[PDB]
Each structure stands twice: as C-alpha cells, then as structure tokens.
Amino acid sequence: MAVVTMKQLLDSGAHFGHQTRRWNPKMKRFIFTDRNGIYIIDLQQTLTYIDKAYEFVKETVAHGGTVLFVGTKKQAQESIAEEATRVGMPYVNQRWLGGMLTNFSTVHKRLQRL
RNA sequence: GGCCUGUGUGCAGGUGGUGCAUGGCUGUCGUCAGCUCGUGUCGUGAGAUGUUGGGUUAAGUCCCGCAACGAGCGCAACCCUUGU
Ligand SMILES: [Mg+2]
Ligand SMILES: [Mg+2]
Ligand SMILES: [Mg+2]
Ligand SMILES: [Mg+2]
Ligand SMILES: [Mg+2]
Ligand SMILES: [Mg+2]
Ligand SMILES: [Mg+2]
Ligand SMILES: [Mg+2]
Ligand SMILES: [Mg+2]
C-alpha cells in the first residue's frame, strides 16, 4: 500500500546519492548501480520499507504513540516546520540541545519558567 | 537574714607556661576575578564536558556553533558623600 508513485518519485529525484568518497560499504546491498560517480538507490526496496514504516506508524498512532520530527539541514527546516505546525505535532528544526531525552526533568524547569 | 572580725574546710588567687590544641579578632596574595554545585554524557580508573574557539568589555559582562541543560559564591545595582 502506497500513495506516492514511482514515476513522480523519479521526477522528485530521491534516488540520487553522494559521491564515491562518502558511500558506506554497509549500503552496498541497497546500492544498485553507479553512473557518472553518483549512486542509484533501489526503488523497490525503498517502496517496501516505506510500506513497512507505513503500517508501523499506523499501529503506533492507533495505540497512541508520539513521534518527534528532527531535522537541521537548511533545505528542509521550513518544510518540516510548516508540516509539523499544520499537523499539530511537536517538532525540532533549528538546534538539537545535548541530552534532551535523557534529561527531561531539568528542562521541565525551563518549560515551566517559559 | 545582711556584714565580717579570729580557726580552718573546700577554694580564691597567677600579665607562670603552652597561638605546633584552641574560640573570637586581625594582616598579606588582592579589591586580583576567579572559584563551585544538580542532572546528563563519555572512559573501567584516577577522571573529562559544562569553564573549548572567534569577537567585545575594567570584570566567568555579553553574542555566535559546539553533549551539554541549569544554578551558586563573585562582578554591577540597591547604602554615604560630592555635581545641578
Ligand atoms: Mg607565657
Ligand atoms: Mg608565639
Ligand atoms: Mg593567585
Ligand atoms: Mg561507565
Ligand atoms: Mg578539560
Ligand atoms: Mg576541567
Ligand atoms: Mg559551557
Ligand atoms: Mg577555572
Ligand atoms: Mg561570576
């Protein structure tokens, strides 16, 4: 089950990877082929794992689970922030403070102060 | 009862000793700006981060990214005088 189709996935160009100086050998199984120094991701595996995460998140939301969105790259901060505020979900987009999850009691004081 | 003259009883009485046992008070480093704690994280262990680098100020006064998030004694203010 999917909503986003392969053709428009190619149009968006999500299959592109990094150069030959950064590829992790543990990602060889994912890697299909390299053309002009850029790797191509396996779209079948991508769709299957997207489906897996799809039912996982469906069950999590049905059972009442909370998911935090994390992203700091400049090119996605605005998009993540807009989507999170439209969907009413807590999010972080600009800076990740050290030990925010392992240390929640201390920052509870900061939240109460705010 | 108060007070004390003669006997003592305990005992008063000592600027006699011990600031290498002490209380309190005081001088210098220096009116220098440095010195700590809670949680977390890392390593086994004595431990490290926070307190690193750049900029700025008389000052750990402040800004920027960084496993750090906060707080404390200090710094300035609140007190006196002098200037209208
Ligand atoms: Mg003597
Ligand atoms: Mg002496
Ligand atoms: Mg000194
Ligand atoms: Mg350990
Ligand atoms: Mg150190
Ligand atoms: Mg240190
Ligand atoms: Mg620090
Ligand atoms: Mg120091
Ligand atoms: Mg200080």
- For chain A, give the DSSP string: --SS-HHHHHHHTTTB---TTS--GGGTTTEEEEETTEEEE-HHHHHHHHHHHHHHHHHHHHHT----EE---HHHHHHHHHHHHHHT--EE-S---TTTTT--HHHHHHHHH-
- Give the integer Cα–Cα distance in Å for A45 and A68: 25
In the reported structure, the alpha carbon of residue A97 is separated from the centroid of ligand 6 by a whole-number distance in angstroms of 21
In the reported structure, the alpha carbon of residue A52 is separated from the centroid of ligand 9 by a whole-number distance in angstroms of 54
A67 CA to B1 C1' in angstroms comes to: 94
- Give the integer Cα–Cα distance in Å for A106 and A84: 25
In the reported structure, the alpha carbon of residue A81 is separated from the centroid of ligand 7 by a whole-number distance in angstroms of 28
- CB A81: neighbour CB atoms within 10 A? 16
Chain centroid to CA A94: how far?
Answer: 15
- Give the integer Cα–Cα distance in Å for A41 and A38: 10
